[PDB]
Amino acid sequence: WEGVVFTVSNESVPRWVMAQIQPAYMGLVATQASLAAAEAVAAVARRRGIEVHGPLQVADPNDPAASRSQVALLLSELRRAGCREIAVDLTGGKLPMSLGAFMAAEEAGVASLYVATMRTATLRQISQP
Amino acid sequence: WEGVVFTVSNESVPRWVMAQIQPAYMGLVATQASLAAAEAVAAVARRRGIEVHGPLQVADPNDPAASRSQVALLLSELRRAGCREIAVDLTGGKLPMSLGAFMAAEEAGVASLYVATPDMRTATLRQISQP
């Protein structure tokens, strides 16, 4: 892989993917709470020479559409910068972030990757076809 | 919703969703590690008059194809029993499970729901969709 777009909740797992595949371009989508992790990923990637796009923030992380659109923007920005082999690692983030990222990646025809290792609750809809 | 298919990791969350939706039909997909929790959801549901299908087991919880196919089996199974407005609740279980359940629900035309509330010594990178 030439490029990788990450949904981010922790910094350690994207770093390990970086070493595995050594891409030339990287995109980062985070929430407000996970922004510091995304910036930590960006900092190590910059000093290895990777071109870093983002982090982009999603206003509501429980809304898959928000994540989907941000990953879409980054997948386009990376294609523009001249990257042709892009994948989306959706390991990080809450479930709707990973789901929105997968949606963006299916909709652009790119490969999705994964790293195998109640009073507040609302019921929400992810998809209605 | 009159039918809900659940991916199961814990027993609490599905129970909570059951109380909110009051479904008539239920489907249950579990891993080996979560089969007991699913059986406990199933026991509670059958005593409330709910027709329960499963729990089915997925052998590889990291393979989304194995989750997709069990959820898809259960959705067709529920429809043949007379259920027709079904939602897939895909909280519970790891990401691959949830994504497999999302794939099966999209291909079946059903809505997907979600309840809104690490050691790197050994890791494998898997491709989950290769379009």
Author numbering:
A (entry chain B): 67 to 183, 194 to 205
B (entry chain A): 67 to 183, 192 to 205
Sentences from the paper on this structure:
Prokaryotic type III CRISPR–Cas systems provide immunity against viruses and plasmids using CRISPR-associated Rossman fold (CARF) protein effectors. We studied WP_013033759 (hereafter named Cam1) from the halophilic Gram-negative chromatiaceae Nitrosococcus halophilus Nc4, which contains a CARF domain fused to a transmembrane domain that does not seem to be capable of degrading nucleic acids, as is the case for all the previously characterized CARF effectors. N. halophilus Cam1 (hereafter NhCam1) has a molecular mass of 22.3 kDa and contains 206 amino acids, with an N-terminal transmembrane helix (TMH) predicted to be 24 amino acids in length by deepTMHMM26 followed by an equally short linker (L1) and a C-terminal intracellular CARF domain. Here we investigated the structure and function of Cam1, a CARF effector that lacks a nuclease domain, but contains a TMH domain that promotes the formation of a tetrameric pore that is required to provide immunity through membrane depolarization and growth arrest of the infected cell (Supplementary Discussion).
We next grew crystals and solved the structure NhCam1-CARF (residues 42–206) in the absence and presence of bound cA4. The 2.2 Å-resolution X-ray structure without the ligand showed that NhCam1-CARF adopts a domain-swapped dimeric topology, in which the β7 strand of one monomer completes the folding topology of a second monomer by pairing with its β6 strand. Loop L2 connects β6 and β7 in one monomer, but this loop is disordered in the other monomer; loop L1 is disordered in both monomers of the CARF dimer. We identified 56 different Cam1 homologues, which we used to perform a MUSCLE protein sequence alignment, finding that D17, but not S24, is highly conserved. Notably, the apo NhCam1-CARF dimer crystal structure aligned to the CARF domain of the model with a root mean-squared deviation of 0.44 Å.
